[PDB]
Amino acid sequence: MQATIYDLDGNTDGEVDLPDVFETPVRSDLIGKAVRAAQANRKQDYGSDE
RNA sequence: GCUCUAAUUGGAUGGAAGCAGGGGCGAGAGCUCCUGUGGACCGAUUAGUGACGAAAAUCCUGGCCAUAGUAGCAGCGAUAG
Ligand SMILES: [Mg+2]
Ligand SMILES: [Mg+2]
Ligand SMILES: [Mg+2]
Ligand SMILES: [Mg+2]
Ligand SMILES: [Mg+2]
Ligand SMILES: [Mg+2]
């Protein structure tokens, strides 16, 4: 498909090919999984005094 | 059903949470409304998180009732007024 390029006045100026990846089938399961992982990976270790 | 995180999305000084008493729903775990009190915070859905649910362990700590206006405040070679 084609994407409409805009200038700083908000007026259409030219257009470009929308790249193929924007046709990637949308997987909300895979997306949820990647997000859960990034969210987990910044959590800090903790525990009570041994 | 409980905690806290995230996204999405709501409620509150025109009165949140909690608590007391009461009305409705669910087989039920439990949900929800009304009144009073309270006087500042509280949810829902989804995906997570876990120090997550008690009637019991001679269980732990604290508080409290009965026991009870009961035992003792006599006994001793110093009977003390
Ligand atoms: Mg050890
Ligand atoms: Mg939502
Ligand atoms: Mg049992
Ligand atoms: Mg005790
Ligand atoms: Mg007696
Ligand atoms: Mg005498």
Swiss-Prot record:
Subunit structure: Part of the 50S ribosomal subunit. Interacts weakly with proteins L18e, L24 and L37e. Has been cross-linked to L18e.
Full-protein interval shown: 1 to 50 of 246
Function: One of the primary rRNA binding proteins, this protein initially binds near the 5'-end of the 23S rRNA. It is important during the early stages of 50S assembly. Makes multiple contacts with different domains of the 23S rRNA in the assembled 50S subunit.
Family: Belongs to the universal ribosomal protein uL4 family.
Gene that specifies this protein: rpl4
Descriptive protein name: Large ribosomal subunit protein uL4
Organism per entry: Haloarcula marismortui (strain ATCC 43049 / DSM 3752 / JCM 8966 / VKM B-1809)
Disulfide-bond pairs as recorded: none
